[PDB]
From a paper:
WDR5 is a highly conserved protein with a seven-bladed β-propeller fold. It is an essential subunit of the SET1/MLL methyltransferase complexes, which regulate gene expression by catalyzing methylation at histone H3K4 sites. WDR5 performs its role by presenting H3K4 for methylation, through the recognition of the guanidyl group of H3R2 by utilizing its central channel of the β-propeller structure located at the top face.
The complex structure revealed that WDR5 exhibits the typical seven-bladed β-propeller structure, while PTENα-NTE adopts a 310-helical conformation fitting into the central WIN site pocket of WDR5. The interaction between PTENα-NTE and WDR5 involves a network of hydrogen bonds, van der Waals contacts, hydrophobic packing, and cation-π interactions, which are observed in other WDR5 complexes involving the accommodation of the WIN motif ligands within the WIN site. While the PTENα-R118 (P-1) residue is embraced by pocket 2 via hydrophobic packing with Y131 and F149 residues of WDR5. Further careful structural analysis revealed that an intramolecular hydrogen bond between the side-chain guanidyl group and the main-chain carbonyl group of R118 allows the side chain of R118 to orient closer to the main chain, eliminating spatial hindrance of its insertion into the P2 pocket. Moreover, even a single PTENα-NTE1–173-R119A mutant was sufficient to abolish its binding to WDR522–334, indicating that the R119 of PTENα is critical for the interaction between PTENα/β-NTE and WDR5.
Author numbering:
A (entry chain A): 1 to 307
B (entry chain B): 1 to 7
Write the structure that this text describes.
C-alpha cells in the first residue's frame, strides 16, 4: 500500500471569481472549499462535486488569504482594506472586524483551539487576536519587511512567520517572544512558510525557485524541493498526507508541482491553469487537491488521485 | 480591484 507516485486528474473547474484568486483552503471537516480573491469576495464550494455554495461579501478591497476555524463554522479573511474579518460560514455574516494593522493584511490562520487568530501584514508586524472579543492581544515587531505567511503549529503553542526580509521566525504564542530565527545563505525573500502536520518541521518557500524543509529546533535543512518557478509571488505550499506523502505547490509556469517528500523527486505535474498557480490546498482526508490561479485564469481546479 | 497577493 505504500504509494510510488500519485495520479491526480482534473475533476472540476470552478469559475465565478471576477478577479485573480488569491487563496483556497479546505474546511477541516472536509465538506467545503473556501476561496478568496482580488474581487473582494469569499466563495464557498462543495469539496466533492465543485458545487457553488455561496458568496461572502463585505471587505472594501481585495482579499489575500482566508482560513477556517477547527470546527469548520468560521472563516477569517485578510484584506487590503487593512482589516481581517471573522465570518459565520453558514450565514455568510461578518461577526467581527479585526482592526489594527496599518497596511494590507496578507496572511491569516486560526490556532487549533480556534480561540486565537494570527495575522501578518505589509506593515511588517505579526498580530495575535482574541476570537471572542476581536481584541488584538499582541503586536510583534516580527520583521523588517512585509510578512508573507503566519501559521500555528499543531498544539497552538508556536507560530512560524516568514517575510521578504529573508527570515523565518518561531514565536511562543503565549509570550510573544521569538524562540528562533531561521536564517540561510544570502537570505532571499521567504514567500511562504508553514509547520508540518506533526509540528517538527517548517516548510519554507523562497523567491529563488526553492522550497526547503527545516527542522526548526535543530536549525538544519532536511530537504530541498526544486524544479518549479517561484521568483515573484507568495505561492502557498502543502504537505499531502492522505495517500503518498507529498509536497504540493503552485508555480509561476502555471503548473501544480507534486514532489515525493522523502526523495525530493518530482512525482507529478498538473497542467490546466493559464496563469500563475498562486494557491494549492490538500483535502484533510481524501486525496484531493485544490489549485487556484491569477488574473488571466481566475479559476479553481479540483484534482483527485487514487493515492 | 486587487489583492496584494495577486499583484
Amino acid at each position: 500500500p505504500t504509494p510510488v507516485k500519485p495520479n491526480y486528474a482534473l475533476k472540476f473547474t470552478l469559475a465565478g471569481h471576477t478577479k485573480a484568486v488569491s487563496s483556497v483552503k479546505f474546511s477541516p471537516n472536509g465538506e467545503w472549499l473556501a476561496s478568496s480573491s482580488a474581487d473582494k469576495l469569499i466563495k464557498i464550494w462543495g469539496a466533492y462535486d465543485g458545487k457553488f455554495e455561496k458568496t461572502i461579501s463585505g471587505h472594501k478591497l481585495g482579499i489575500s488569504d482566508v482560513a477556517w476555524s477547527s470546527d469548520s463554522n468560521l472563516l477569517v479573511s485578510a484584506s487590503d482594506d487593512k482589516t481581517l474579518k471573522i465570518w459565520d460560514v453558514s450565514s455568510g455574516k461578518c461577526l467581527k472586524t479585526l482592526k489594527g494593522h496599518s497596511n494590507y493584511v496578507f496572511c491569516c490562520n486560526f490556532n487549533p483551539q480556534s480561540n486565537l487568530i494570527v495575522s501578518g501584514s505589509f506593515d511588517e508586524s505579526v498580530r495575535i487576536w482574541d476570537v471572542k472579543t476581536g481584541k488584538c492581544l499582541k503586536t510583534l515587531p516580527a520583521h523588517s519587511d512585509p510578512v508573507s505567511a503566519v501559521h500555528f503549529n499543531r498544539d497552538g503553542s508556536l507560530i512560524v512567520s516568514s517575510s521578504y526580509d529573508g527570515l523565518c521566525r518561531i514565536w511562543d504564542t503565549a509570550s510573544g517572544q521569538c524562540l528562533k530565527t531561521l536564517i540561510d545563505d544570502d537570505n532571499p525573500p521567504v514567500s511562504f512558510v508553514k509547520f508540518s502536520p506533526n509540528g517538527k518541521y517548517i516548510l519554507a518557500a523562497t523567491l529563488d525557485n526553492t522550497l526547503k524543509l527545516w527542522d526548526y529546533s535543530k536549525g538544519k535543512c532536511l530537504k530541498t524541493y526544486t524544479g518549479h518557478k517561484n521568483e515573484k509571488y507568495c505561492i502557498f505550499a502543502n504537505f499531502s498526507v492522505t495517500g503518498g506523502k507529498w509536497i504540493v505547490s503552485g508555480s509561476e509556469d502555471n503548473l501544480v508541482y507534486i514532489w515525493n517528500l522523502q526523495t525530493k523527486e518530482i512525482v507529478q505535474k498538473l497542467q490546466g491553469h493559464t496563469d500563475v498557480v498562486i494557491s494549492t490546498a490538500c483535502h484533510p482526508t481524501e486525496n484531493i487537491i485544490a489549485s487556484a490561479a491569477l488574473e488571466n485564469d481566475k479559476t479553481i481546479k479540483l484534482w483527485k488521485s487514487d493515492c | 480591484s486587487s489583492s496584494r497577493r495577486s499583484s
